[PDB]
Design a protein around this ligand. Sequence first.
Ligand SMILES: O=C(Nc1ccccc1)c1cccc([C@H]2C[C@@H]2NC2CCC2)c1
Ligand SMILES: O=C(Nc1ccccc1)c1cccc([C@H]2C[C@@H]2NC2CCC2)c1
Ligand SMILES: O=C(Nc1ccccc1)c1cccc([C@H]2C[C@@H]2NC2CCC2)c1
Lengths: 666, 133
Amino acid sequence: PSGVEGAAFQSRLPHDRMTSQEAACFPDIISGPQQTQKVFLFIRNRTLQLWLDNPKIQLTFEATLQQLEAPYNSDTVLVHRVHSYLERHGLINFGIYKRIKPLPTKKTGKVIIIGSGVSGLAAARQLQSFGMDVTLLEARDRVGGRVATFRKGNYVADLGAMVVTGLGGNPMAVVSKQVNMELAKIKQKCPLYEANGQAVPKEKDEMVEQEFNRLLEATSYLSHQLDFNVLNNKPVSLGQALEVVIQLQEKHVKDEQIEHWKKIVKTQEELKELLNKMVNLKEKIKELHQQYKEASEVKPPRDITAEFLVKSKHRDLTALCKEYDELAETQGKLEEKLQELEANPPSDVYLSSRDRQILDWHFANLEFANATPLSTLSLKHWDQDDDFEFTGSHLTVRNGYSCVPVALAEGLDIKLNTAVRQVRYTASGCEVIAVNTRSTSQTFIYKCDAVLCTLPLGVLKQQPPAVQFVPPLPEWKTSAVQRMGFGNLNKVVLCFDRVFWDPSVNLFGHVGSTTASRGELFLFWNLYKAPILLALVAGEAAGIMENISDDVIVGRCLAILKGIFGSSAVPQPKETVVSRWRADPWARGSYSYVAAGSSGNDYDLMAQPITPGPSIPGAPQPIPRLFFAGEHTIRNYPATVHGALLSGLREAGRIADQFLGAMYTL
Amino acid sequence: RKPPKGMFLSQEDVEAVSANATAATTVLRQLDMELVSVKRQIQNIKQTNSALKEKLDGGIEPYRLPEVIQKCNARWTTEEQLLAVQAIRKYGRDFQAISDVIGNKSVVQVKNFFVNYRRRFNIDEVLQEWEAE
Ligand SMILES: O=C(Nc1ccccc1)c1cccc([C@H]2C[C@@H]2NC2CCC2)c1
Ligand SMILES: O=C(Nc1ccccc1)c1cccc([C@H]2C[C@@H]2NC2CCC2)c1
Ligand SMILES: O=C(Nc1ccccc1)c1cccc([C@H]2C[C@@H]2NC2CCC2)c1
């Protein structure tokens, strides 16, 4: 899209209507006449544009009005409200911009942010920019969280997020103009190679892929049009629905052969019955010829009855000689029909074990996308965020994705090696109790008006608790935590001195020998300038290979690679790294997924802040003190970096509105 | 609104597979064991049909008789009047067959004949006899 209307789309907003959020800040406009709305709407859209086409500098409210054109630059406060709203919720002036208006000498309110993952860093940066005192507590010795970039010498390989999902409507686009990310497109090509190491014939690669895609669309049809979402009182998973569809597709293959061979028997017996008539007729014609000959043998001159007998038998025999011929037309006609059916026999199988093996690799990709075995995904809701996917090619960050969190950390008060252990929130405020990770006896008390928790859903899930809440989170929040799915997904980084793969290919496959091992090193990535290949471990394999040493794992890599490229071309790797995210105490997994029995509605539960009870009884109801960001709190963009970032922007808005006041509602 | 093409997903079918844990494997095996039932029965009927063909070797070709190409005639010789009365007794009212016994008379005046000599040849009486059989 183009112009002001493109700015609305590039900010994930409908250009021609007002969103529920801005209805809530501008109940006058959306409640008023259409004219004003289009004013507001245009007034918003231009402002977004101004921010967007230069997001390396603050878009100040003065520079906004200054460049509006009448009549849109006449309601001086509607502009000031619009700009204020946009600045509050980080639709403008977010990320890393050179500030025109310098920060305020003295601050307002204290926020402790748990975790300096992207969602943490994004809020901190916004909250600081609103004049609040912000400190981040971070268990690791580095920022970024699940954005984790390996760096030894000139090797640069990313153990965490690798790909930006397309700049159409993506905030990371903005970040990439403010930071030097070297973004490189991912060519959608992906050559398979099966367990032996020989490519999959383009006949197959195409038809199995096509079957996978239809098996998916099939499950979607069982879900929405047949309402197959409950089986023996339990939620149906994607995995089950896939097995159901595959079985019904095998069942049909069988039913198809049954009705076909039952067409050969229906006519083989129609033949048998015909030949019975034929054979019986031939016998009758055996007798009549003898009878005619005997009557014919009486030599003339004969009396007329003996003449009738020859004449009679003769016609009687040419009649029976007529039926036996009208029957042999019929024998010929069924003989071709029988031959015909033998010649167009239906499909012998649905999918051979050869095939089902290659289909298993399409499933490992799906299990990678969801960081979990398909038996856990909600059939109904697993893809519930498809509608919000951005437009464009997927990209990788060629200099490492760390550059982004590290950039965002500039100017922030981060306490590294500081493991929050207890969060205490009360009507009067909060204390956060952390220890030092190097030596746990060292203890820290942090006191603040509000806590922003970006603890990963796996951390929040941990039993016994890595982090204690005082008081306990309400059961509506803890239930959402149990219901949701925090998956697992691991990478092997292989660094060689010589590029020996197809350097025009970003990603190529390896078909897993078994259904169980379908996730075990099934997919390789050539994303980097240095000779680095990167191998996935997904699905049921992810949790398994965690309990297996790196040397065994880099072995199974070299084996799979050698079989596909030849033992001469594979050197030994110069540096190796094997992620283990389920074991990582500050992750306890990779990212969220919509578990069976969950829904995207849990992602909203996650994001909904906690308000403590009153200290004094009968005191007025208090302010919310505990807020939540992180990729598991944004239902429309889960399990992604732009999801994290957006959620952090969202909270810094909700928090600042609560503690600094939203003055743009009048 | 409808499944993708090639995919077969009936409402009925799913319950059958869904109803028990091993239901799919049995239902498939039923079909699997019912297919051998059908292929084993083709082999049976194919072998039975092969024999029945073994018997019809020769066709009916030793037993065919040369076609009698004969110009039709309208005059009833006393001979072929007598062929007729006999033909009527052995056939009744199959006016065609009665014509090819005679072979000089066409089909129609066999029809004619019936009324013409109806009393002189007692055709009614003759036709009663044919109805005993
Ligand atoms: O299958 C894939 N192939 C692949 C195989 C290997 C590597 C990458 C990709 C695939 C991957 C990502 C998305 C999709 C979208 C169409 C599917 N959604 C619906 C509409 C058709 C099913 C497919
Ligand atoms: O295997 C997959 N992805 C993949 C991509 C690249 C490499 C490997 C694997 C995949 C297959 C089917 C559906 C999806 C869902 C998430 C995507 N949502 C989109 C589909 C249009 C909306 C992912
Ligand atoms: O996190 C993800 N989505 C997700 C989906 C469902 C539940 C949770 C999370 C995601 C992860 C890996 C790959 C993809 C690729 C396929 C999608 N490609 C786009 C361009 C073709 C459609 C998505």
